[PDB]
Amino acid sequence: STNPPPPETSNPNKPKRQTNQLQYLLRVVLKTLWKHQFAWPFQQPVDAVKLNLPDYYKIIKTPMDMGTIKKRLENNYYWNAQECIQDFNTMFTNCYIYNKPGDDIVLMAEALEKLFLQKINELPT
Numbered sequence: 815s816t817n818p819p820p821p822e823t824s825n826p827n828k829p830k831r832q833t834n835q836l837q838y839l840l841r842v843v844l845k846t847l848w849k850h851q852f853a854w855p856f857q858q859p860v861d862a863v864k865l866n867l868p869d870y871y872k873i874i875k876t877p878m879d880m881g882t883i884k885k886r887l888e889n890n891y892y893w894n895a896q897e898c899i900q901d902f903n904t905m906f907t908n909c910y911i912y913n914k915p916g917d918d919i920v921l922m923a924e925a926l927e928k929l930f931l932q933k934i935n936e937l938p939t
């Protein structure tokens with residue numbers, strides 16, 4: 815079995831920026847989720863080989879995870895906050911697509927997403 819290459823975290827052709835909102839996304843939003851007790855499944859790409867999920871990447875064609883997001887933020891990969899917020903949303907969405915209501919992993923995602931929403935509610939404007 816094989817995992818796909820992970821999402822890129824640097825791109826020499828992609829314009830870079832660090833806005834005050836992107837700084838907040840790294841230093842407040844990502845940091846807060848990363849330290850949460852339920853962060854661990856989301857700190858790296860889904861390893862479909864080690865988790866024995868042979869259909870994961872048949873179903874999920876836009877993978878995302880907080881390890882990737884963290885590196886993107888550290889590299890100033892994003893131009894704007896919305897790109898980063900979209901990556902968080904993709905990560906959560908993938909979990910809900912692949913898994914089922916009431917699954918432990920879904921409950922964990924929901925708790926993290928609630929915290930995510932609380933923190934981005936106060937993005938500096």
Ligand SMILES: COc1cc(C(=O)N2CCC(N3CCN(C)CC3)CC2)ccc1Nc1ncc2c(n1)N(C)c1ccccc1C(=O)N2C
Nearest residue numbers: 854855856857858859860861865867908909912913918919
């Ligand atoms: C750090 O990477 C992982 C480690 C482990 C793992 O074996 N352990 C050791 C045991 C440990 N538990 C010990 C018992 N304790 C009560 C809770 C903690 C948790 C960590 C398990 C999963 C890991 N990564 C992981 N990535 C993405 C997933 C996913 N899993 N889960 C939960 C999924 C499982 C099935 C299908 C999909 C997923 C999934 O969507 N994601 C995001």
